[PDB]
Amino acid sequence: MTEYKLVVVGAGGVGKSALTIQLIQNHFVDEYDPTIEDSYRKQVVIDGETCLLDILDTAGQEEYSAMRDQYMRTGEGFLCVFAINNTKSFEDIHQYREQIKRVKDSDDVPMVLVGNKCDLAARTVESRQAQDLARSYGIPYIETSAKTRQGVEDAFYTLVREIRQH
Amino acid sequence: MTEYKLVVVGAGGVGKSALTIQLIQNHFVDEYDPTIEDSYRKQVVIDGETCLLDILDTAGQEEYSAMRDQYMRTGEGFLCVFAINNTKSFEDIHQYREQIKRVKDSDDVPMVLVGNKCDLAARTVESRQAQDLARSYGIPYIETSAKTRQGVEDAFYTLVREIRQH
Ligand SMILES: C[C@@H](OP(=O)(O)OP(=O)(O)OP(=O)(O)OC[C@H]1O[C@@H](n2cnc3c(=O)[nH]c(N)nc32)[C@H](O)[C@@H]1O)c1ccccc1[N+](=O)[O-]
Ligand SMILES: C[C@@H](OP(=O)(O)OP(=O)(O)OP(=O)(O)OC[C@H]1O[C@@H](n2cnc3c(=O)[nH]c(N)nc32)[C@H](O)[C@@H]1O)c1ccccc1[N+](=O)[O-]
Ligand SMILES: [Mg+2]
Ligand SMILES: [Mg+2]
C-alpha cells in the first residue's frame, strides 16, 4: 500500500503530541506524552485509498540540533504547529520551515500550517496573521483543537493530499 | 465580512443538493430538493475567519444551456461532483470543467473534485481513477457521503481555502 511519512513539528508546548494522540488513539492527552522519536503507524482509508500513516511526533526545544536534520530528511510532508495563544511559537515557525528547506534542498516541501488550541478564549495570534503567513509560504492554513477534535483530521488529511499532488 | 460564492456542479443525480443540504441544514435529503437557482447563505467560521458562504446548488441536465454561463461567471470556486457508482457522471466532469474554463477565461479556477456516495458498496469508479484525474487538473480530490456526512465539511472547506490562496 501507499505509505505516507509525516513529521509533526513546532515549538515546545504547542500540542504536537496531543494532535497525534487525538488522531491515532482518539482521546485528548492532558498528560505528558513521550516526546522523542515517537512514531505512530496506522492503516487508514483517505478518499478511498488504503494507506499507511507513519507519523513522527517530535520534541520541541532545540536540543534537537542536527537530529532534526535526520528526521527532516526522511519526511515526505510536515505539519508545522504553533499555538494560537502564543506569538513566540508563531514567530518560531519561520525557523522550522527554513531548516526543512535547508535539508530538503527545496523551496516547496509538502507542508501545512496548523494553529492549534483554537478552543481557547485568549488568542494572541489572529487567524488573519497566520492566514497571510501561509499565503506567503503557499501552503494551507488550518486551525485545530486536540481538546475538541476540531480540525484534527482536516489538518492531517490535507497534508496527505498535499503530498499526493507533489 | 469575507464572503465566498461557491457553485455546486455535476451531472443529474450525483448528490449536489444532498451535499448542500447536509452542510446547511444538517440532514440527508432522500426527497427531491428544488434544483434550479437554489441559493443557501450561511455565516460560518472557517479556520478562525468569520465568513459568509453563498452557495448555488445547480440543476444537472443540460437544459442549463447558457444559464450555466451566467452562474459560472459569478462563481469564485466550484465543487465538481460525480457519483462513485456512475462512470458517466465521472466522464462528464471534463465537460463541466471546460465550460467553466471557457467562461472564466482561465486555466486555473478554484475547484475541488468530489466523488460522492462513498457509503455505497458497488462503486464503478476507483479512487485511483479520480485521484489521477484531479492530479491531471491540479486540484484536490475528496470523497464524500451526504448520507453519512463523511467528507462533507472537508470538501466545502477545502474549496474555501483553495479560493484563499488564489
Ligand atoms: C516538554 C515540551 O513538550 P513538547 O512535546 O514540545 O509539547 P507538545 O507540543 O507535544 O505539546 P503536548 O501535546 O504535550 O501538549 C501540551 C499542553 O497543551 C495542551 N494542549 C494541547 N493541545 C491542546 C488543545 O487543542 N487545547 C488545549 N486547551 N490544550 C491543548 C495539552 O493538553 C498539554 O497540557 C513542552 C515545552 C514547553 C511547555 C510545555 C511542554 N510540554 O510538553 O508540556
Ligand atoms: C432531477 C435530477 O436532479 P439533480 O439535482 O441533478 O440531482 P442532485 O445531483 O441534486 O442529487 P440529489 O441531492 O437530489 O440526490 C440524488 C439521489 O441520490 C441520493 N444521494 C445523494 N447523496 C447520497 C449519498 O452520499 N449516499 C447515498 N446513498 N445516496 C445519496 C439522494 O438521497 C437522492 O435519492 C436527477 C437526475 C437524474 C437522476 C436523479 C435526479 N434526481 O434529482 O433524483
Ligand atoms: Mg510531545
Ligand atoms: Mg438537486
From Swiss-Prot, chains A, B:
InterPro entries assigned: P-loop_NTPase, Small_GTP-bd, Small_GTPase, Small_GTPase_Ras-type
Motif Effector region mapped to chain: 32-40
GO annotation, cellular component aspect: ciliary basal body; cytoplasm; cytosol; endoplasmic reticulum membrane; glutamatergic synapse; Golgi apparatus; Golgi membrane; GTPase complex
UniProt family annotation: Belongs to the small GTPase superfamily. Ras family.
Substitution effect: T35S: Loss of interaction with PLCE1
Gene that this sequence comes from: HRAS
Chief location: membrane
Illness association: Costello syndrome: A rare condition characterized by prenatally increased growth, postnatal growth deficiency, intellectual disability, distinctive facial appearance, cardiovascular abnormalities (typically pulmonic stenosis, hypertrophic cardiomyopathy and/or atrial tachycardia), tumor predisposition, skin and musculoskeletal abnormalities. Congenital myopathy with excess of muscle spindles: Variant of Costello syndrome.
Tissue: Widely expressed.
Result of altering D119N: Loss of GTP-binding activity
Name this protein carries in UniProt: GTPase HRas
Glycosylation sites: T35
Lineage: Eukaryota, Metazoa, Chordata, Craniata, Vertebrata
Keyword Repressor: no
Function per UniProt: Involved in the activation of Ras protein signal transduction. Ras proteins bind GDP/GTP and possess intrinsic GTPase activity.
Documented effect of changing S39C: No effect on interaction with PLCE1
Chain positions with S-nitrosocysteine modification: C118
Membrane topology annotation: Lipid-anchor
